[PDB]
Design a protein around this ligand. Structure first.
Ligand SMILES: *[C@@H]1O[C@H](CO)[C@@H](O[C@@H]2O[C@H](CO)[C@@H](O[C@@H]3O[C@H](CO[C@H]4O[C@H](CO)[C@@H](O)[C@H](O)[C@@H]4O)[C@@H](O)[C@H](O[C@H]4O[C@H](CO)[C@@H](O)[C@H](O)[C@@H]4O[C@H]4O[C@H](CO)[C@@H](O)[C@H](O)[C@@H]4O)[C@@H]3O)[C@H](O)[C@H]2NC(C)=O)[C@H](O)[C@H]1NC(C)=O
Ligand SMILES: *[C@@H]1O[C@H](CO)[C@@H](O[C@@H]2O[C@H](CO)[C@@H](O[C@@H]3O[C@H](CO[C@H]4O[C@H](CO)[C@@H](O)[C@H](O)[C@@H]4O)[C@@H](O)[C@H](O[C@H]4O[C@H](CO)[C@@H](O)[C@H](O)[C@@H]4O[C@H]4O[C@H](CO)[C@@H](O)[C@H](O)[C@@H]4O)[C@@H]3O)[C@H](O)[C@H]2NC(C)=O)[C@H](O)[C@H]1NC(C)=O
Ligand SMILES: *[C@@H]1O[C@H](CO)[C@@H](O[C@@H]2O[C@H](CO)[C@@H](O[C@@H]3O[C@H](CO[C@H]4O[C@H](CO)[C@@H](O)[C@H](O)[C@@H]4O)[C@@H](O)[C@H](O[C@H]4O[C@H](CO)[C@@H](O)[C@H](O)[C@@H]4O[C@H]4O[C@H](CO)[C@@H](O)[C@H](O)[C@@H]4O)[C@@H]3O)[C@H](O)[C@H]2NC(C)=O)[C@H](O)[C@H]1NC(C)=O
Ligand SMILES: *[C@@H]1O[C@H](CO)[C@@H](O[C@@H]2O[C@H](CO)[C@@H](O[C@@H]3O[C@H](CO)[C@@H](O)[C@H](O)[C@@H]3O)[C@H](O)[C@H]2NC(C)=O)[C@H](O)[C@H]1NC(C)=O
Ligand SMILES: *[C@@H]1O[C@H](CO)[C@@H](O[C@@H]2O[C@H](CO)[C@@H](O[C@@H]3O[C@H](CO)[C@@H](O)[C@H](O)[C@@H]3O)[C@H](O)[C@H]2NC(C)=O)[C@H](O)[C@H]1NC(C)=O
Ligand SMILES: *[C@@H]1O[C@H](CO)[C@@H](O[C@@H]2O[C@H](CO)[C@@H](O[C@@H]3O[C@H](CO)[C@@H](O)[C@H](O)[C@@H]3O)[C@H](O)[C@H]2NC(C)=O)[C@H](O)[C@H]1NC(C)=O
Ligand SMILES: *[C@@H]1O[C@H](CO)[C@@H](O[C@@H]2O[C@H](CO)[C@@H](O[C@@H]3O[C@H](CO)[C@@H](O)[C@H](O)[C@@H]3O)[C@H](O)[C@H]2NC(C)=O)[C@H](O)[C@H]1NC(C)=O
Ligand SMILES: *[C@@H]1O[C@H](CO[C@@H]2O[C@@H](C)[C@@H](O)[C@@H](O)[C@@H]2O)[C@@H](O[C@@H]2O[C@H](CO)[C@@H](O)[C@H](O)[C@H]2NC(C)=O)[C@H](O)[C@H]1NC(C)=O
Ligand SMILES: *[C@@H]1O[C@H](CO)[C@@H](O[C@@H]2O[C@H](CO)[C@@H](O)[C@H](O)[C@H]2NC(C)=O)[C@H](O)[C@H]1NC(C)=O
Ligand SMILES: *[C@@H]1O[C@H](CO)[C@@H](O[C@@H]2O[C@H](CO)[C@@H](O)[C@H](O)[C@H]2NC(C)=O)[C@H](O)[C@H]1NC(C)=O
Ligand SMILES: *[C@@H]1O[C@H](CO)[C@@H](O[C@@H]2O[C@H](CO)[C@@H](O)[C@H](O)[C@H]2NC(C)=O)[C@H](O)[C@H]1NC(C)=O
Ligand SMILES: *[C@@H]1O[C@H](CO)[C@@H](O[C@@H]2O[C@H](CO)[C@@H](O)[C@H](O)[C@H]2NC(C)=O)[C@H](O)[C@H]1NC(C)=O
Ligand SMILES: *[C@@H]1O[C@H](CO)[C@@H](O[C@@H]2O[C@H](CO)[C@@H](O)[C@H](O)[C@H]2NC(C)=O)[C@H](O)[C@H]1NC(C)=O
Ligand SMILES: *[C@@H]1O[C@H](CO)[C@@H](O[C@@H]2O[C@H](CO)[C@@H](O)[C@H](O)[C@H]2NC(C)=O)[C@H](O)[C@H]1NC(C)=O
Ligand SMILES: *[C@@H]1O[C@H](CO)[C@@H](O)[C@H](O[C@@H]2O[C@@H](C)[C@@H](O)[C@@H](O)[C@@H]2O)[C@H]1NC(C)=O
Ligand SMILES: *[C@@H]1O[C@H](CO)[C@@H](O)[C@H](O)[C@H]1NC(C)=O
Ligand SMILES: *[C@@H]1O[C@H](CO)[C@@H](O)[C@H](O)[C@H]1NC(C)=O
Lengths: 200, 156, 194, 161, 193, 154
């Protein structure tokens, strides 16, 4: 590929794994399982599924904070993800279990009255999925009913987004690892939230 | 706002080592290309150089923590990258137009001088990379830019 | 005129009305009325008055959220407006009514009476949300920042239908887009876990 | 941080590096096309009110052509996209000038110089306002004259090559 | 010192004191005491000590806000400092007293050692009183994540103007530097927020 | 976003009240103009804070109660907060850094032309010796010569 007989077109592919020690890296394994890795020890597994693991409406996030048994690196990631969901209002949609320091967060992306006109451009999923799409951006589009051309009415066939702590393993089968998803969300978090109290 | 981080000097330019590339050993870039990263706010390649250079300095200069910490990278993000390039490529993906996913770059290399252009991101579309015949306009623009620069070098 | 013998001075006025499809546009009707429009269907009415509409001290937001009903584009505008008020602490000063999905927010400016007070903070945000011609709203109008004040007693924000009310000034996206940046910059700590 | 959106390809006849404002984008006016030597400045400077507006108009144009519309309008897209399009500190500069009684840009009106034999134009500058109305031509004649000399300088440099 | 036979090297030192009317200025007196001055009347005293003052677990911010007896410029500074702590999850660590419009804020640094409260509080301190903040630490540099000091408490109180700068000159940089990162490193504490 | 404030007053002068143990100092347009394009000059960011303060005092009514609300809004138009972060990072990593106090510049011996001041760096509680950054001083001397020659060639 020698252009004009003078300029060779050459390529470069970056190994972003060398960045694991200072910043989280995310990748896609397949349509339902996506990952965020931290260093060479841990990270989060983000699964789009039809099976719940939490079957209650408690979270007790404030208890987790007092006890301080969780890995701070992972709680930081969860906080960035949650605050990057635009217009979150349906608080019952999220439930969690931090028992023992383990991290487990479940969003219910199920939409009530689905057969009421399109009725699919304001539900939580329309958000949670947008946030997800960014967190695992290198390959997340494969998991959506429509990967692109639709920003506001994004839907998937999966009913729950479950985010759980996972040990480090090489799961980057669909896409390379990249720090970009996480880094992008850091400037979006809290930018578009609703007020729940007169004094925030 | 704007980036401020200065890349560690190579005597001029910048070079990536073998562990930074996918099976490509080492690649060094000339100072006249690297220097453009101090002026541009729209180059995905330059932002990656800053994240890697940061990673290296943090590892070599700070005492390792008992456990990995994310505080340092969060503080440094804006100093190192233009976050609006993540937003840009996000917008391009949702609007169905080719965009940079940051893993692959390309550049032109003059065969008799060994000088290269600053790398541009190889774009993707329907889950895969576009063709030299799809972004042929950018390849040709880079060739023209290099020609102008080679002529200026001969003049000076 | 003609500059240097070769250039004609020419002007543009931008029709920012075509931006309604993507972003809220705000304008001024007169001294008491200002508007924020969304698309070609709805928007908020910003009124400076000497009368109340709400005669209580409640603002159940956690029932507006649970029930949805409200227009999300408009709730986002209300949240942007409120969070940008600097040093808001007099929570009793604001009351609201979101029953049925309607939007109604009332800010009491008499509550806090001179300079550096709550009413002035509320107006400083007001003056930016409806910036394109907002000067009409003040007792002074310039040369003052923490001493910005009006003779009016209440700032009332309510949902309306689209109607062309841009009589004092043209519509522009700038007020809203400007306030999106300094969204949480002046919020006081009230809860340690925050 | 810093805006990244670039303008879309405006017209198939006009220089590709330029930008056209169609009739629907202007008040009581026909199509106005700015050349590439004016428009290119929008990829370099962070202090041009006109360029920030071009990006908002161009963004809107693309968003309504490439994305599926919801039944009800949403502003979620602009709330994220705006940072890539405009300098919010330019808005703040004009805000501060207003409170301090300094003439400022309210973004509704712009002016430019247009060469009478070539059709070459400057990038439009904002027409400033003060005390409830627009400033007179005299009042900013210094800026008009400076732009006229800047245009002459650029043309002489091009002729020199 | 003449460079190239053409230029003399000259210096300039800025007097940041004239900025007092628009923005807070902070400086260092000694290892235990640092200050933030506001205007020409007041400010905050930031002291690293082994003596507690509050001796209880309450922090009545909601009461302070309702009463509104505090100087707003100083409440703003306290809020900027507090929200800048990267991983604050120990509500018990910070106690306060705003009685009468007085400002008294106390942070407990005793559980130190990596990724702890003292680390986050001290990192914020390091920026708020950046001019000379390092002199109070066990390790001046080369350690970001496991920062320690021998002092058990960080106490911030309202004070009066006086020339309290001995180790470093007044500077607006600490405060201004914190404003842009003021809310960037916060844990979620509510499902809806 | 990025800085936008325009210094109000060509060139720019720092009055006696703005300097430690010094009289009025003035820089010309060639050096001042650099503050409108570069994002990494500590001197230029301070130059904007001083100019802002001067205008805010002259043009706005001062409230009886002291307030810092104006700067909380104005700050991002005035300074690069990532320049502050850069110097913070250099400090924690044991790299010489700018604490925005002392600056240096080169002054031409027959014309009085000056460079834009660069920050004098500090490390381990003191200012670095001139020798240690003499390479940057030498580079600036060549940069000044280069600009002067270009003007002569123009
Ligand atoms: C930007 O956009 C580009 C464009 O799409 C995207 O590039 C693609 O990245 C993926 C992920 O790296 C590449 O996928 C690889 O494909 C090879 C070949 O696949 C064929 O053969 C396998 C054999 O099993 C078949 O199943 C498959 O269907 C094909 O026929 C695979 O071999 C790769 O898998 C190995 O590497 C993985 C990651 O390390 C391992 O998890 C996996 O287990 C495999 O490991 C093997 O080697 C190990 C030692 O190295 C050994 O220990 C193991 O036991 C095992 O033997 C992988 O699936 C895809 O080809 C790229 N496509 C293009 C066009 O380039 C970028 O990823 C995207 N960037 C970002 C940041 O998003
Ligand atoms: C930046 O800052 C500038 C300066 O402050 C500001 O400019 C001003 O903008 C407003 C808004 O467009 C301009 O106001 C218009 O003025 C015309 C003319 O008014 C004069 O002439 C009439 C002649 O009969 C007199 O009666 C009148 O007293 C004045 O002397 C008005 O006609 C406009 O009103 C019509 O349009 C409105 C909607 O925009 C309607 O709501 C209104 O009812 C009127 O509609 C009628 O006519 C329509 C045809 O045009 C018809 O379709 C309708 O059915 C109906 O019959 C309006 O008041 C003002 O003049 C500008 N000032 C200057 C100095 O130029 C910018 O707006 C500001 N920009 C931003 C973004 O902030
Ligand atoms: C960026 O980084 C640099 C390098 O670290 C840092 O520079 C240092 O700043 C400090 C603060 O200004 C300088 O400290 C001054 O030093 C003089 C001289 O000290 C010698 O002489 C005294 C005599 O008593 C000895 O005790 C001392 O050990 C030394 O031998 C002192 O005189 C200064 O103290 C007086 O002024 C202070 C206020 O400015 C008062 O608080 C203090 O009590 C003293 O006041 C008395 O004298 C005044 C004389 O005018 C009088 O008016 C008063 O009423 C009273 O009687 C002070 O300690 C230090 O020397 C600088 N170091 C270097 C290498 O230059 C920058 O500050 C830092 N900048 C930023 C923005 O972060
Ligand atoms: C992320 O998930 C893993 C599990 O997939 C967690 O690992 C282990 O969790 C158990 C929970 O009870 C810990 O408790 C007990 O530890 C003793 C240690 O001797 C063991 O004998 C018991 O059988 C039981 O496992 C266990 O310590 C923990 N493993 C390690 C190495 O600590 C992991 O803790 C979760 N992540 C976080 C941050 O908690
Ligand atoms: C809100 O903004 C939209 C544009 O973003 C405004 O609608 C646009 O109006 C123009 C002029 O009426 C339309 O142009 C012409 O439409 C005819 C239709 O038959 C077509 O044949 C012409 O070739 C030309 O396209 C434009 O299409 C239309 N945009 C859309 C999406 O339909 C709208 O009026 C604004 N609303 C308010 C209240 O101002
Ligand atoms: C908006 O805020 C103002 C001020 O907070 C409220 O007005 C205040 O109303 C109280 C009564 O609720 C007045 O005090 C008492 O009034 C009775 C009247 O008969 C008098 O007998 C008592 O001795 C006592 O003065 C108070 O003076 C008055 N203050 C002001 C400045 O007007 C107002 O009601 C609030 N309105 C809304 C809609 O929230
Ligand atoms: C806080 O900072 C202000 C500066 O922002 C300091 O006040 C300034 O003090 C100087 C010297 O006293 C005043 O200069 C005056 O100039 C006129 C020129 O005609 C001359 O006639 C006067 O005799 C005097 O020299 C300057 O105007 C004044 N600035 C302001 C805004 O009032 C103040 O001293 C600092 N306070 C503390 C505690 O450091
Ligand atoms: C809105 O009310 C103000 C204040 O009026 C007083 O306080 C009210 C709450 C109510 O109790 C009134 O009866 C009181 O008179 C009006 O502004 C005042 O107007 C008078 C002349 O009538 C003048 O002497 C005062 O100086 C004005 N005060 C201020 C702060 O400017 C205002 O005009 C009323 N607005 C409207 C639209 O009627
Ligand atoms: C959150 O706290 C609630 C407390 O109301 C827990 O709910 C009950 O707790 C008591 C005492 O621990 C138990 O005996 C009940 O059986 C619990 N009920 C249920 C339905 O769980 C709740 O379990 C806590 N949830 C989490 C995730 O910690
Ligand atoms: C907001 O919600 C609270 C709680 O439902 C309302 O307060 C109650 O109002 C009803 C109807 O008047 C009374 O029967 C109850 O006794 C009130 N107390 C509570 C806490 O239940 C409040 O009225 C609502 N907001 C409004 C419209 O004021
Ligand atoms: C503000 O919004 C409300 C809610 O959309 C509008 O009131 C609704 O009008 C429809 C008309 O068919 C009724 O069916 C609904 O029951 C009404 N709901 C409520 C809560 O009132 C209201 O009209 C809007 N305001 C204005 C001025 O139009
Ligand atoms: C600061 O925190 C330490 C530890 O949380 C507190 O010290 C404890 O005091 C109790 C008695 O009340 C003792 O039984 C513990 O053994 C002490 N622990 C440690 C580590 O010293 C200390 O009192 C707190 N300071 C203040 C002012 O509340
Ligand atoms: C505050 O008090 C603590 C004790 O509660 C001091 O900590 C240690 O004290 C022993 C006394 O034998 C010393 O040998 C250790 O070296 C001290 N540890 C450290 C880290 O200093 C602590 O020094 C006191 N702090 C101050 C500032 O006086
Ligand atoms: C810190 O602020 C408090 C509250 O303003 C100051 O104490 C007040 O002083 C005035 C006299 O100037 C008395 O009339 C008040 O009764 C005092 N109130 C309280 C709560 O004590 C206090 O002096 C300030 N601190 C310093 C060092 O000056
Ligand atoms: C998850 O379970 C629900 C039942 O609660 C199914 O209805 C979902 O499948 C849906 O219908 C099928 C036929 C197909 O169109 C699918 O795309 C729809 O989402 C089921 N989803 C999955 C992934 O199994
Ligand atoms: C997807 O495929 C279609 C096939 O016609 C092509 O036109 C389009 O450009 C491709 N790109 C994207 C991002 O969808
Ligand atoms: C315009 O200036 C005059 C000067 O007398 C003043 O009275 C009037 O209020 C000013 N108008 C505006 C809109 O500020």
């Amino acid at each position: 590929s020698l252009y004009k007989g003078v300029y060779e077109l050459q390529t470069l592919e970056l190994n972003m794994e060398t960045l694991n020690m200072t910043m989280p890296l995310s990748c896609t394994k397949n349509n339902s399982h996506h990952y965020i890795m931290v260093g060479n020890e841990t990270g989060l597994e983000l699964t789009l599924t039809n099976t719940s693991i939490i079957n209650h409406k408690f979270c007790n996030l404030s208890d987790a904070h007092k006890k301080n048994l969780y890995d701070h690196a992972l709680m930081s990631i969860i906080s960035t993800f949650h605050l990057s969901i635009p217009n979150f209002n349906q608080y019952e949609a999220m439930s969690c279990d931090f028992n023992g320091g383990k991290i487990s967060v479940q969003y219910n992306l199920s939409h009530s009255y689905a057969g009421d006109a399109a009725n699919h451009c304001g539900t939580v999923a329309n958000g949670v999925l947008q946030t997800f799409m960014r967190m695992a951006w290198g390959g997340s589009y494969i998991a959506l009913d429509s990967g692109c051309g639709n920003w506001d009415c994004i839907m998937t066939s999966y009913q729950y987004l479950i985010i759980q702590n996972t040990t480090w393993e090489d799961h980057c089968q669909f896409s390379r690892p990249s720090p970009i998803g996480y880094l992008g969300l850091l400037s979006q978090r809290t930018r578009d939230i609703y007020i729940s109290r007169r004094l925030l | 706002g704007t980036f401020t981080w200065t890349l560690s000097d190579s005597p001029g330019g910048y070079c990536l080592t073998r562990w930074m590339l996918i099976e490509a050993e080492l690649k060094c870039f000339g100072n006249t290309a690297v220097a453009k990263c101090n002026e541009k706010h729209d180059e995905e390649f330059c932002d990656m150089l800053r994240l890697f250079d940061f990673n290296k300095q943090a590892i070599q200069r700070l005492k390792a923590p008992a456990q990995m910490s994310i505080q340092l990278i969060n503080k440094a993000v804006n100093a190192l990258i233009n976050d609006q390039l993540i937003m840009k490529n996000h917008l391009r993906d949702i609007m169905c137009i080719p965009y940079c996913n940051y893993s692959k770059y390309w550049y032109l290399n003059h065969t008799t001088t060994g000088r290269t252009s600053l790398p541009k991101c190889w774009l993707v579309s329907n889950g895969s990379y576009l063709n030299e015949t799809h972004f042929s306009d950018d390849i040709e623009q880079q060739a023209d830019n290099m020609i102008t620069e080679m002529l200026q070098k001969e003049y000076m």
